[PDB]
């Protein structure tokens, strides 16, 4: 689970 789409 990553912070957003940049990850």
């Amino acid at each position: 689970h990553v912070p957003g789409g940049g990850s």
Partner: antibody
Amino acid sequence: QVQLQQSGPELVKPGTSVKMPCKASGYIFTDYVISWVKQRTGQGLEWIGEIFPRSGSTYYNEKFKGKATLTADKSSNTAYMQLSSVTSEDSAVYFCARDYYGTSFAMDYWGQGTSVTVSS
Amino acid sequence: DIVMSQSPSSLAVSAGEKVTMSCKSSQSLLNSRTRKNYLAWYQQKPGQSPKLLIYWASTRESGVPDRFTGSGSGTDFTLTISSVQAEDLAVYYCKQSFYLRTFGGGTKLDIKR
């Protein structure tokens, strides 16, 4: 239909806690993140944080770290947001939302919002 | 981390007219891999919850009239409403989902008649 079912209106005293459910139906609860959004009367929208129900992993807007606590119960398809040590500043409508993590990263379905008044 | 700016803060037009409104981000919202800007537009009518209009800066969501168009890249984004309707009375928010989430302060659309 996708649907997010939030609790009714709430009065809560200053310096106590409130816990509000967001009951998900119409999709695979464990496939999508649940986001929470704050809206003070006559103000804009403000992101609180998100939970991944599959794993219980959370992320928070830095202002709501320790204020807001996000949980999920996979057996009931229900996400919960607790607010602790509440002040009059926490008086707001609070939305839950299905967040299409992985692809769109957009909030494609919203609950009807839960109105919270913080007052003695 | 990321700060979002919307302008103008308020706007008024007659039914059938065009409006555009602008959204600015403090860092680029383009992901080099994927090629997508993580920028979405939301509509909130009075007394209602918000509704997703556009994601990936330019992709209309399902259920959204084609008069609503999103455009821009990196740090500068635009929402266009071709031929405004009475029913388009709302506040329009842009929002970043590149890293965490941030909403702009909104653009309120009033209607002249």
